Design a protein around this ligand. Structure first.
Ligand SMILES: COc1ccc(C2=NN(C3CCCCCC3)C(=O)[C@@H]3CC=CC[C@H]23)cc1-c1ccc(C(=O)NCC(N)=O)cc1
Ligand SMILES: [Mg+2]
Ligand SMILES: [Zn+2]
Length: 333
């Protein structure tokens, strides 16, 4: 990795984000990307500001410059794809900030853990190519073969973790260089555990483990922390439907498109194409958003709120409300 230049840093630092509150649950990253013709620097500054406003990097000996070098080393490794690009990980970072500090989930974690979560957000989809793990396995692509041969089916998540480790192995971009011994180990392990937990194939069992730990007043305390961190990063990653309707809708269009591209490539390769990824097999968002709400997001948010994260009730209220709004799209079609 080439080190970050004074000039790259400068270009982020000049962005002032007039009229945006990055800490608000109704912050609108799409309005932010439009606001200038340098949307990547704006996103970077959003992340810089979120991290500095937490007060956390300062506490763990991470200078403002090492923080920003890191953000930029992360950013150079995202791709120009419709959904799993740099704006997604910035969105996850911001969203986590709100769960921690508007939803008071910070009370369940140490400051270090809060810090790790915010950093982990920005590493968690590094070098994503717009194709899911299933694609690499079905096509016997080289990374798919390596994953099968090595016994880990989380093709992409292990890859993201490998790139996060390389960024952090340079002191210039190691946000954890101020740590040592147990703390350093904890930062790396918890970051890696959270990224590995974002594989949706493990959704049900990560949710069930957290729920059973929350209900158990004798749960091991370090395990409860780790799982809380995992569940918060997962919540960030499926949080699109917890946002104001127009925001949620623009996310939905972005993912939908990326899925369709995968499906096109799966056609051109002659492998199985799921209906979800099949262009010629769908005419509408509404039914798909509702489906995702009903089977994935609403049960996830409601369970974790009721189990433990009472402060995040707004997410459940907003899902309910977005669902009703998609139902009006159907009722009036
Ligand atoms: C905002 O919506 C989403 C947000 C995140 C994800 C993610 N799915 N998974 C899985 C995908 C397989 C089965 C469902 C469970 C979740 C991922 O592992 C992604 C990466 C990590 C987290 C969630 C992401 C998916 C959606 C979404 C995309 C398309 C439709 C749709 O019905 N497609 C047809 C149409 N024509 O409408 C509906 C919702
Ligand atoms: Mg991912
Ligand atoms: Zn993600």
């Amino acid at each position: 990795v080439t080190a970050i230049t004074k000039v790259e840093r400068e270009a982020v630092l000049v962005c002032e984000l007039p009229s945006f509150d990055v800490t608000d649950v109704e912050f609108d990253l799409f309005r932010a990307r439009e606001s200038t013709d340098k949307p990547l620097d704006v996103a970077a500054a959003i992340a810089y500001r979120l991290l500095l406003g937490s007060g956390l990097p300062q506490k763990f000996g991470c200078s403002d410059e090492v923080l920003l070098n890191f953000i930029l080393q992360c950013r150079k490794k995202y791709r120009n794809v419709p959904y799993h690009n740099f704006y997604h990980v910035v969105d996850v970072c911001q969203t986590i900030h709100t769960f921690l500090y508007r939803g008071n989930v910070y009370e369940k974690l140490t400051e270090l853990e809060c810090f790790v979560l915010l950093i982990t957000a920005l590493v968690h989809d590094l070098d994503h190519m717009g194709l899911n793990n299933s694609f690499y396995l079905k096509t016997e692509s080289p990374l798919g073969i390596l994953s099968s041969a090595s016994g880990n089916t989380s093709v992409l998540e292990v890859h993201h973790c490998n790139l996060a480790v390389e960024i952090l192995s340079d002191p210039e971009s190691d946000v954890f260089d101020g740590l040592e011994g147990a703390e350093r180990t904890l930062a790396f392990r918890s970051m890696i555990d959270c990224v590995l937990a974002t594989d949706m194939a493990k959704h049900g069992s990560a949710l069930e483990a957290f729920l059973a730990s929350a209900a158990d007043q004798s749960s091991d305390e370090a395990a409860f922390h780790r799982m809380t961190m995992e569940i918060i990063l997962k919540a960030g990653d499926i949080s699109n439907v917890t946002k104001p309707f127009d925001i949620s809708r623009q996310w939905a269009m972005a993912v939908t498109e990326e899925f369709y591209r995968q499906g096109d490539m799966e056609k051109e390769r002659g492998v199985e194409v799921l209906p979800m990824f099949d262009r010629s097999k769908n005419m509408e968002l509404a039914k798909g958003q509702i489906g995702f709400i009903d089977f994935v997001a609403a049960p996830f948010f409601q369970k974790i709120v009721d189990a433990c994260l009472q402060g995040m009730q707004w997410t459940v209220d907003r899902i309910k409300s977005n669902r009703a709004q998609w139902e009006r799209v159907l009722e009036t079609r």
